[PDB]
Coordinates of C-alpha atoms in Angstrom, one line a residue:
Chain N
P1 CA -11.2 -14.7 -27.7
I2 CA -10.1 -11.4 -26.9
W3 CA -8.5 -13.2 -23.5
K4 CA -6.9 -15.5 -26.2
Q5 CA -5.2 -12.9 -27.9
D6 CA -1.6 -11.4 -27.3
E7 CA -1.3 -9.0 -24.6
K8 CA 1.3 -7.1 -26.6
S9 CA -0.9 -6.5 -29.4
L10 CA -4.1 -5.3 -27.8
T11 CA -4.8 -2.1 -27.1
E12 CA -7.3 -0.3 -24.3
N13 CA -9.9 0.4 -26.4
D14 CA -10.0 -3.6 -27.1
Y15 CA -10.2 -3.8 -23.4
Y16 CA -12.8 -1.0 -22.6
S17 CA -14.9 -1.9 -25.4
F18 CA -14.9 -5.9 -24.3
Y19 CA -15.8 -5.0 -20.7
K20 CA -17.9 -1.7 -21.8
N21 CA -19.9 -4.5 -24.0
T22 CA -20.0 -7.9 -22.0
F23 CA -20.8 -5.8 -18.6
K24 CA -23.1 -3.2 -20.1
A25 CA -21.0 -0.3 -17.9
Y26 CA -20.5 2.8 -19.8
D27 CA -18.0 3.6 -16.9
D28 CA -14.3 3.6 -17.9
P29 CA -12.5 1.2 -15.5
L30 CA -10.3 2.6 -13.1
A31 CA -8.0 -0.5 -13.4
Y32 CA -7.7 -3.9 -15.4
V33 CA -5.1 -6.7 -15.7
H34 CA -4.7 -9.2 -18.5
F35 CA -3.0 -12.2 -17.2
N36 CA -2.4 -15.9 -18.8
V37 CA -1.4 -18.5 -16.7
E38 CA 0.5 -20.5 -18.3
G39 CA 1.8 -24.2 -17.9
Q40 CA 0.3 -27.1 -16.6
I41 CA -2.8 -25.2 -15.1
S42 CA -4.2 -23.4 -17.9
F43 CA -6.2 -20.3 -17.9
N44 CA -6.6 -16.4 -18.9
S45 CA -8.0 -14.0 -17.4
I46 CA -9.2 -10.1 -17.4
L47 CA -10.2 -8.6 -14.6
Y48 CA -11.6 -5.0 -14.2
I49 CA -12.2 -2.6 -11.4
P50 CA -15.1 -0.9 -12.7
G51 CA -14.9 3.7 -12.9
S52 CA -18.2 3.8 -11.0
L53 CA -20.3 1.4 -8.3
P54 CA -22.1 -1.1 -10.4
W55 CA -25.9 -0.8 -9.7
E56 CA -26.8 -4.2 -9.2
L57 CA -24.5 -3.1 -5.9
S58 CA -25.8 -0.1 -5.3
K59 CA -28.9 -1.4 -3.3
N60 CA -27.3 -4.7 -1.9
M61 CA -23.4 -5.2 -1.2
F62 CA -23.7 -8.7 -1.9
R63 CA -22.6 -11.5 -12.4
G64 CA -19.1 -10.1 -11.1
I65 CA -16.8 -12.9 -13.1
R66 CA -17.7 -15.0 -16.1
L67 CA -16.3 -18.7 -16.2
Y68 CA -15.2 -20.2 -19.4
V69 CA -14.2 -23.6 -19.6
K70 CA -12.5 -24.5 -22.3
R71 CA -13.7 -21.4 -24.6
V72 CA -17.1 -22.2 -23.8
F73 CA -19.2 -20.2 -21.7
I74 CA -20.3 -22.0 -18.1
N75 CA -22.0 -19.1 -16.4
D76 CA -21.7 -15.4 -14.9
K77 CA -21.6 -16.3 -11.5
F78 CA -18.4 -16.8 -10.8
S79 CA -17.9 -14.0 -8.3
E80 CA -19.6 -16.2 -5.9
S81 CA -16.7 -18.4 -6.3
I82 CA -14.1 -15.8 -5.5
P83 CA -14.1 -14.5 -1.7
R84 CA -16.9 -12.2 -2.0
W85 CA -15.1 -8.7 -0.3
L86 CA -14.1 -9.1 -4.4
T87 CA -17.8 -9.1 -5.6
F88 CA -17.5 -5.4 -7.2
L89 CA -14.3 -7.1 -9.2
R90 CA -16.3 -7.9 -13.5
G91 CA -14.5 -10.0 -15.1
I92 CA -13.2 -13.1 -17.3
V93 CA -11.8 -16.6 -16.5
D94 CA -11.4 -19.1 -19.2
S95 CA -9.6 -22.5 -17.4
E96 CA -8.8 -25.5 -19.1
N97 CA -9.2 -27.5 -15.7
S98 CA -12.2 -28.3 -6.0
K99 CA -8.4 -28.4 -6.6
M100 CA -8.6 -25.9 -9.1
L101 CA -10.8 -23.6 -8.3
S102 CA -8.9 -23.2 -5.4
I103 CA -5.3 -22.2 -7.1
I104 CA -7.8 -20.0 -9.6
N105 CA -9.0 -17.9 -6.8
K106 CA -5.5 -17.3 -5.0
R107 CA -4.2 -16.2 -8.3
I108 CA -7.3 -13.9 -9.1
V109 CA -6.6 -12.6 -5.5
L110 CA -3.0 -11.9 -5.8
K111 CA -3.4 -10.3 -9.0
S112 CA -6.4 -7.9 -8.1
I113 CA -4.3 -6.5 -4.8
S114 CA -1.2 -6.1 -6.9
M115 CA -3.6 -3.8 -9.2
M116 CA -4.8 -2.3 -6.4
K117 CA -1.4 -1.6 -5.0
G118 CA -0.5 -0.4 -8.2
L119 CA -3.3 2.4 -8.1
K120 CA -2.2 3.6 -5.2
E121 CA 1.0 3.8 -6.0
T122 CA -0.5 6.2 -9.0
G123 CA -1.9 7.9 -6.2
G124 CA -4.1 10.9 -7.2
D125 CA -7.9 11.5 -7.5
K126 CA -7.7 8.0 -9.4
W127 CA -7.3 6.4 -6.2
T128 CA -9.5 8.7 -3.9
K129 CA -12.3 7.8 -6.5
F130 CA -11.5 3.9 -5.7
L131 CA -11.6 3.9 -2.2
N132 CA -14.7 6.2 -2.2
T133 CA -16.5 3.8 -4.4
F134 CA -15.0 0.2 -3.2
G135 CA -13.1 1.0 0.2
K136 CA -16.3 -0.5 2.1
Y137 CA -15.2 -4.0 0.7
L138 CA -11.5 -3.7 1.6
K139 CA -12.8 -3.0 5.2
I140 CA -14.7 -6.4 4.8
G141 CA -11.6 -8.1 3.3
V142 CA -9.1 -7.2 6.1
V143 CA -11.9 -9.3 8.3
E144 CA -12.3 -12.2 5.9
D145 CA -9.6 -12.6 4.1
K146 CA -7.3 -13.9 7.1
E147 CA -4.0 -14.8 4.5
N148 CA -4.4 -11.4 2.9
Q149 CA -5.2 -9.4 6.0
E150 CA -2.3 -7.1 6.3
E151 CA -1.7 -6.3 2.8
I152 CA -5.8 -5.6 2.4
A153 CA -5.8 -3.5 5.5
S154 CA -2.8 -1.3 4.1
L155 CA -5.0 -0.4 1.9
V156 CA -7.7 1.0 4.0
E157 CA -7.9 4.4 5.3
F158 CA -10.1 6.2 7.9
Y159 CA -10.9 10.1 8.7
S160 CA -8.5 10.7 12.5
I161 CA -8.1 13.7 14.4
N162 CA -5.2 15.3 12.5
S163 CA -5.7 14.1 9.0
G164 CA -8.4 16.9 8.9
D165 CA -10.8 16.9 5.7
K166 CA -8.9 13.9 3.9
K167 CA -8.4 10.5 5.5
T168 CA -5.5 8.5 6.6
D169 CA -3.7 5.0 5.7
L170 CA -2.6 2.9 8.3
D171 CA 1.0 3.0 7.2
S172 CA 1.1 7.2 7.5
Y173 CA -0.4 6.9 10.9
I174 CA 2.5 4.7 12.3
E175 CA 5.3 7.2 10.4
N176 CA 3.1 9.7 12.7
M177 CA 3.5 8.1 16.0
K178 CA 5.0 10.4 18.5
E179 CA 8.3 9.0 20.1
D180 CA 6.4 7.5 23.3
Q181 CA 3.7 6.2 21.2
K182 CA 3.2 2.5 21.5
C183 CA -0.6 1.8 20.0
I184 CA -2.8 2.7 17.3
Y185 CA -5.7 4.5 18.6
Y186 CA -9.4 4.7 17.1
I187 CA -12.8 5.7 18.6
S188 CA -16.2 5.9 17.8
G189 CA -18.5 8.7 16.2
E190 CA -21.5 9.8 14.9
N191 CA -19.3 11.4 12.3
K192 CA -16.5 13.4 12.0
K193 CA -17.2 16.4 13.9
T194 CA -19.2 14.8 16.9
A195 CA -16.3 12.2 17.1
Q196 CA -13.5 14.8 17.3
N197 CA -15.1 16.7 19.9
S198 CA -15.4 13.3 22.3
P199 CA -13.8 14.1 25.9
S200 CA -12.8 10.7 26.0
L201 CA -10.0 11.6 24.0
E202 CA -8.6 14.5 26.8
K203 CA -5.7 12.4 27.7
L204 CA -4.7 11.1 24.5
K205 CA -5.0 14.9 22.9
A206 CA -2.4 15.8 25.9
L207 CA -0.3 13.1 24.4
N208 CA -0.5 14.7 21.3
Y209 CA -1.4 11.0 20.0
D210 CA -3.7 10.7 16.6
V211 CA -6.8 8.5 16.7
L212 CA -8.5 7.0 13.8
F213 CA -12.1 7.6 13.8
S214 CA -15.2 4.4 13.4
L215 CA -17.8 6.4 11.6
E216 CA -20.2 3.1 10.5
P217 CA -20.3 -0.1 11.1
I218 CA -18.0 -1.4 8.4
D219 CA -15.6 0.4 10.4
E220 CA -16.1 -1.2 13.5
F221 CA -15.9 -4.4 12.2
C222 CA -12.5 -3.6 10.2
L223 CA -11.2 -1.9 13.1
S224 CA -11.8 -4.8 15.8
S225 CA -10.7 -7.3 13.6
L226 CA -7.1 -5.2 14.2
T227 CA -7.5 -5.2 17.6
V228 CA -7.3 -9.2 17.7
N229 CA -4.9 -9.7 15.0
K230 CA -2.8 -6.5 15.1
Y231 CA -1.6 -4.5 12.2
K232 CA 1.9 -4.6 11.3
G233 CA 2.6 -5.8 15.0
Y234 CA 0.9 -2.6 16.6
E235 CA -1.8 -3.0 18.5
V236 CA -5.2 -1.1 18.3
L237 CA -6.9 0.0 20.9
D238 CA -10.4 1.8 21.1
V239 CA -10.3 4.8 23.1
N240 CA -13.7 3.5 24.6
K241 CA -12.8 -0.2 25.8
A242 CA -9.4 -0.7 27.5
Chain F
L1 CA 15.8 26.3 -8.8
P2 CA 17.6 22.3 -8.7
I3 CA 15.8 19.5 -10.7
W4 CA 14.4 17.6 -7.6
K5 CA 12.2 21.3 -6.8
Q6 CA 10.9 21.2 -9.8
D7 CA 7.9 19.7 -11.3
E8 CA 8.5 16.2 -13.1
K9 CA 5.9 17.5 -15.4
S10 CA 7.9 20.0 -17.5
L11 CA 11.0 18.1 -17.2
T12 CA 12.0 15.4 -20.0
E13 CA 14.2 12.4 -20.2
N14 CA 16.9 14.1 -21.5
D15 CA 16.8 16.7 -18.0
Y16 CA 17.1 13.6 -16.0
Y17 CA 19.4 11.8 -17.6
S18 CA 21.8 14.6 -18.0
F19 CA 21.4 16.0 -14.4
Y20 CA 22.6 12.2 -13.6
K21 CA 25.5 12.7 -15.8
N22 CA 26.4 16.4 -14.3
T23 CA 25.7 15.0 -11.0
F24 CA 27.2 11.6 -10.3
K25 CA 29.9 12.3 -12.8
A26 CA 29.1 9.0 -15.0
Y27 CA 29.2 8.7 -18.8
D28 CA 26.7 6.3 -19.7
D29 CA 22.6 6.5 -19.7
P30 CA 21.2 5.4 -16.7
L31 CA 18.9 2.3 -16.8
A32 CA 15.5 3.6 -15.1
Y33 CA 14.9 6.5 -12.8
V34 CA 12.2 8.0 -10.3
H35 CA 11.6 11.1 -8.9
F36 CA 9.0 11.1 -5.9
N37 CA 8.4 14.1 -3.7
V38 CA 7.0 13.5 0.0
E39 CA 4.9 15.4 1.5
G40 CA 4.2 15.6 5.4
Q41 CA 6.4 15.5 8.4
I42 CA 7.8 13.7 6.4
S43 CA 8.7 16.5 3.4
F44 CA 11.5 15.1 1.2
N45 CA 12.5 15.2 -2.6
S46 CA 14.1 12.2 -4.0
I47 CA 15.1 11.1 -7.7
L48 CA 16.8 7.4 -7.9
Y49 CA 19.1 6.6 -10.7
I50 CA 19.9 3.1 -11.6
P51 CA 22.9 2.9 -13.3
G52 CA 23.7 2.0 -16.9
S53 CA 27.0 0.3 -15.6
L54 CA 29.3 -0.6 -12.5
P55 CA 29.9 2.3 -10.3
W56 CA 33.8 2.3 -10.3
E57 CA 33.7 2.6 -6.4
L58 CA 31.9 -1.2 -6.9
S59 CA 34.0 -1.9 -9.6
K60 CA 37.0 -3.9 -7.1
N61 CA 34.9 -5.3 -4.4
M62 CA 31.3 -6.0 -4.7
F63 CA 31.0 -2.8 -1.6
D64 CA 32.5 -0.1 -1.1
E65 CA 33.2 0.2 2.7
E66 CA 32.4 4.7 2.2
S67 CA 28.8 3.6 0.5
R68 CA 28.4 6.9 -1.6
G69 CA 26.1 7.2 -4.0
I70 CA 22.8 8.7 -2.5
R71 CA 23.7 12.4 -1.8
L72 CA 21.8 14.2 0.9
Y73 CA 20.4 17.6 0.6
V74 CA 19.1 19.4 3.6
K75 CA 16.8 22.9 2.4
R76 CA 18.6 22.5 -0.9
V77 CA 22.4 22.6 0.7
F78 CA 24.1 19.9 -0.1
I79 CA 25.8 17.7 3.1
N80 CA 27.3 14.7 1.8
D81 CA 27.2 11.6 -0.4
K82 CA 27.4 8.9 2.5
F83 CA 24.0 8.9 3.0
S84 CA 23.3 5.1 1.2
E85 CA 25.3 4.0 4.9
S86 CA 21.9 3.4 6.2
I87 CA 20.3 1.6 3.6
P88 CA 20.5 -2.3 3.1
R89 CA 23.4 -2.6 1.0
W90 CA 22.3 -4.6 -1.4
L91 CA 21.1 -1.4 -2.7
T92 CA 24.3 0.1 -2.5
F93 CA 24.5 0.2 -6.3
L94 CA 21.8 3.0 -6.5
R95 CA 22.8 6.7 -7.1
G96 CA 20.7 9.8 -6.4
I97 CA 19.4 12.5 -4.3
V98 CA 17.5 13.3 -1.7
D99 CA 16.5 16.6 0.0
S100 CA 15.0 16.8 3.4
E101 CA 13.2 20.0 4.8
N102 CA 14.3 18.5 8.4
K103 CA 19.7 5.8 13.6
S104 CA 16.7 8.0 13.7
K105 CA 12.9 6.8 13.5
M106 CA 12.8 9.1 10.8
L107 CA 15.7 8.9 8.6
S108 CA 14.3 5.6 9.1
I109 CA 10.8 6.6 7.0
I110 CA 13.0 7.8 4.6
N111 CA 15.1 4.8 4.1
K112 CA 11.6 2.9 3.9
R113 CA 10.4 4.5 1.4
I114 CA 13.6 5.0 -0.7
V115 CA 13.6 1.0 -0.7
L116 CA 10.2 0.7 -1.5
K117 CA 10.5 2.9 -4.8
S118 CA 13.7 0.8 -5.7
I119 CA 11.8 -1.8 -5.8
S120 CA 9.1 -0.8 -7.7
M121 CA 11.4 0.8 -9.8
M122 CA 13.2 -2.5 -10.9
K123 CA 9.5 -4.4 -10.8
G124 CA 8.9 -1.8 -14.1
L125 CA 11.3 -2.1 -15.3
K126 CA 11.3 -6.4 -15.4
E127 CA 7.9 -5.7 -16.7
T128 CA 8.6 -2.9 -19.5
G129 CA 12.2 -3.8 -20.3
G130 CA 13.0 -6.4 -21.8
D131 CA 16.6 -6.4 -23.3
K132 CA 17.1 -3.6 -20.6
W133 CA 16.1 -5.8 -17.8
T134 CA 18.3 -9.0 -18.9
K135 CA 21.1 -5.6 -18.8
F136 CA 19.8 -5.0 -15.2
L137 CA 20.1 -8.5 -14.2
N138 CA 23.9 -8.7 -16.2
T139 CA 24.6 -6.2 -13.9
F140 CA 23.6 -5.7 -11.1
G141 CA 21.5 -9.1 -10.5
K142 CA 24.6 -10.3 -8.4
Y143 CA 22.6 -7.1 -5.9
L144 CA 19.8 -8.2 -5.9
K145 CA 21.0 -11.9 -4.9
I146 CA 22.2 -10.7 -2.2
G147 CA 19.4 -8.7 -1.2
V148 CA 17.4 -11.7 -0.8
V149 CA 20.1 -13.0 1.4
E150 CA 20.2 -9.8 3.6
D151 CA 17.1 -8.0 3.5
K152 CA 14.8 -10.0 5.7
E153 CA 11.6 -7.8 5.0
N154 CA 11.8 -7.8 1.6
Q155 CA 13.2 -10.8 0.8
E156 CA 10.4 -12.5 -1.0
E157 CA 9.9 -9.5 -3.5
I158 CA 13.5 -9.3 -4.2
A159 CA 13.2 -13.0 -4.9
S160 CA 10.8 -12.3 -7.4
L161 CA 12.9 -10.9 -9.6
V162 CA 16.5 -13.0 -9.9
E163 CA 17.0 -15.6 -12.5
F164 CA 18.8 -18.5 -12.7
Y165 CA 19.4 -21.0 -16.0
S166 CA 17.7 -24.4 -15.4
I167 CA 17.9 -27.6 -17.6
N168 CA 15.0 -26.5 -19.6
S169 CA 15.3 -22.9 -19.6
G170 CA 17.9 -22.7 -22.7
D171 CA 20.3 -20.3 -23.2
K172 CA 18.0 -17.8 -21.1
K173 CA 17.5 -17.3 -17.6
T174 CA 14.3 -18.4 -15.4
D175 CA 12.7 -16.4 -13.2
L176 CA 11.1 -18.5 -9.9
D177 CA 7.7 -18.3 -11.1
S178 CA 8.1 -19.2 -14.4
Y179 CA 9.6 -22.4 -12.6
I180 CA 6.4 -22.6 -10.5
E181 CA 4.2 -22.2 -13.1
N182 CA 6.0 -25.1 -15.2
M183 CA 5.8 -27.4 -12.5
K184 CA 4.6 -30.9 -12.7
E185 CA 1.3 -32.2 -11.7
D186 CA 2.7 -33.4 -8.4
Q187 CA 5.9 -31.9 -7.9
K188 CA 5.8 -30.1 -4.7
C189 CA 9.6 -28.0 -4.5
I190 CA 11.9 -25.7 -6.6
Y191 CA 15.2 -28.2 -7.3
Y192 CA 18.3 -26.9 -7.7
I193 CA 21.8 -28.2 -8.3
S194 CA 26.0 -26.5 -7.9
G195 CA 27.2 -26.1 -11.2
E196 CA 30.9 -24.9 -12.3
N197 CA 29.1 -24.4 -16.1
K198 CA 25.6 -23.8 -17.7
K199 CA 26.5 -27.0 -19.4
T200 CA 28.7 -29.1 -17.5
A201 CA 25.6 -28.6 -14.6
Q202 CA 22.6 -30.7 -16.0
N203 CA 25.7 -33.6 -16.5
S204 CA 25.6 -34.3 -13.1
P205 CA 24.9 -38.0 -11.9
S206 CA 22.7 -36.5 -8.8
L207 CA 19.7 -35.4 -11.1
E208 CA 19.1 -38.8 -12.5
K209 CA 15.4 -39.5 -10.6
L210 CA 14.7 -35.6 -11.1
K211 CA 15.2 -35.7 -14.7
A212 CA 13.6 -39.7 -14.6
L213 CA 10.5 -36.9 -12.7
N214 CA 10.6 -34.6 -15.9
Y215 CA 11.0 -32.1 -12.7
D216 CA 13.2 -28.4 -14.0
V217 CA 16.6 -27.9 -11.9
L218 CA 17.7 -24.5 -11.3
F219 CA 22.0 -24.0 -11.7
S220 CA 23.3 -22.5 -8.8
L221 CA 26.6 -21.1 -10.2
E222 CA 28.5 -19.5 -7.8
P223 CA 28.6 -19.0 -3.6
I224 CA 26.2 -16.2 -4.3
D225 CA 23.5 -18.3 -6.5
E226 CA 24.3 -20.8 -3.8
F227 CA 23.7 -18.5 -0.9
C228 CA 21.1 -16.7 -2.7
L229 CA 19.4 -20.2 -3.5
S230 CA 19.7 -21.5 0.1
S231 CA 18.2 -18.6 1.6
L232 CA 15.4 -19.5 0.0
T233 CA 15.5 -22.8 1.4
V234 CA 14.9 -21.7 4.6
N235 CA 11.7 -19.3 4.2
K236 CA 10.7 -20.8 1.4
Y237 CA 9.9 -18.8 -1.5
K238 CA 6.0 -18.2 -2.0
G239 CA 5.4 -21.3 0.5
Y240 CA 7.6 -23.4 -1.9
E241 CA 10.4 -25.5 -0.3
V242 CA 13.5 -25.0 -2.4
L243 CA 16.0 -28.0 -2.2
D244 CA 19.4 -28.6 -3.4
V245 CA 19.5 -31.7 -5.2
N246 CA 22.4 -33.2 -2.5

C-alpha cells in the first residue's frame, strides 16, 4: 500500500522507514524514486540506491527488488529479472500484468539512470560516495547494456595523469583535450603511482595529452568496450596496444 | 563583489530577483533561475533566468537579430550583451550572465554547459511547478517547439517538455509521455492532426478511423505546432513514429 499512496502526501521519513524495515538497512539511501505508471500497462515502483554497499554484495558482486502482482507478494527475487548491473538497487514493483517484464524493465532502467544523473548534477560527497560504492556496477553496465552504453559511460570515472588525487569523468576529459588531440588514451597500471611512471607514456606526455588509468580488471573490461564502440564518437586507445 | 561570485548559500531568492530586475531592467519576477560555477580550465560563473514574461526585444518578432539576453563578463568586467548569438536560438528568451576567467572549442564548452543547465532548470520547473509550468509553456512553449525542430542534439529532451491539446485531453494539454502512457494495446503510433481551433480540430472527418479505434490524436494549431510535430515525424519520439492523420 505504501507504493499505492499518493506521492504528494508521502514524505521522506515514510520512504526511509519503508526502505529501512523492508530491506533491513540502517543506511540512509542516497536516492529514491517513487514512480507510478500509468494507464494501459499498469504499475507502481519505488526504487532505492542504498547509502552503502549491501552486505550480501560485499562478498559476491552478483534480493534487490520485490515483485508484487496485483498487490500480492510474489518474490523478492525480481533483481534477477533486471540487467544485472542494477543488482545493487533495492525496491518494489507492483504490476497488474515476457512482453511486460520487458517494458517494466526498460522503464526501471530509465528511471534508475535518471536518478543517478540527478545525483551527479547535485554532485558533492554524495555523488563521490555513490561512485566509490557502486561505480564498479556502472562500469559493467557500460559493456553489458548496449542501449544505454553511452549514458552509463558518461557517469563512470577514472584516475588519469592530470586528475591527480581525484578521478575524472569522460566528458571532462573530452573538454580538456588539447587542440591537436583526436583520441581518448588510457593505460593499465598496478596502481596510480606505478601507472603514471610508465615510460610508455613519454610520447603522450610530450604532447601534453592526458591518459586515463585502468587499475583493475573491471576498468579494463569497461574501457576496452569503449575501444570497440567508441565514446561519443571518440576513439579510446590503450597506450600499450594499437 | 558581484552576486555571481558570492556563494549561493548566503543569498536569498530576493537577492537573485533584485539582481535580475536591476540588471536586465525587467519588471516582472523571473519564473526560475539557476546559479552555477564551473572550476578548472574551464573556469566561469553563470546565473541564468527564465523571464516572467516575453522580453521586449522578443515582443515583435520571435527572434531578435541582435540576440542580446546573456551578458558576458571577463574577469568581472562587462564586455557586451550579445553572448546569446552563439547559443541555440531557441534559447534566446533566457536572460543571464556569464563571467569567464579566460567559434572556439571553448566558447563551445561554455555554450554546451549553458544549454544543459537551461534544460535541467525547465525540467525542474515541469516537475515542481504546476501553474508556473503552464505559464512557462503559454509564454515560451513556442521556443521549445522550435528547439525540437532546430536543436538536433537535444531534440528528445526538449520534445519531452512540449504540450498539445488532444481529443482526450480536455481544456488541458497533454505532454508526449502521457500520450504514450495512454496508448491502446496494439496502438503503435502517435497521431496528430492539423486543426484550426481546439473545438473544430476534433470535428474532422479524416479522424473517423482513429476515433473508431479510440486512439488519441494531438492537435497542431499552428505552423510551429506543425513544424514541431513533423520533426518528430522524421527521427521519431522515443522510438515512436508520429503520424499526421493525413
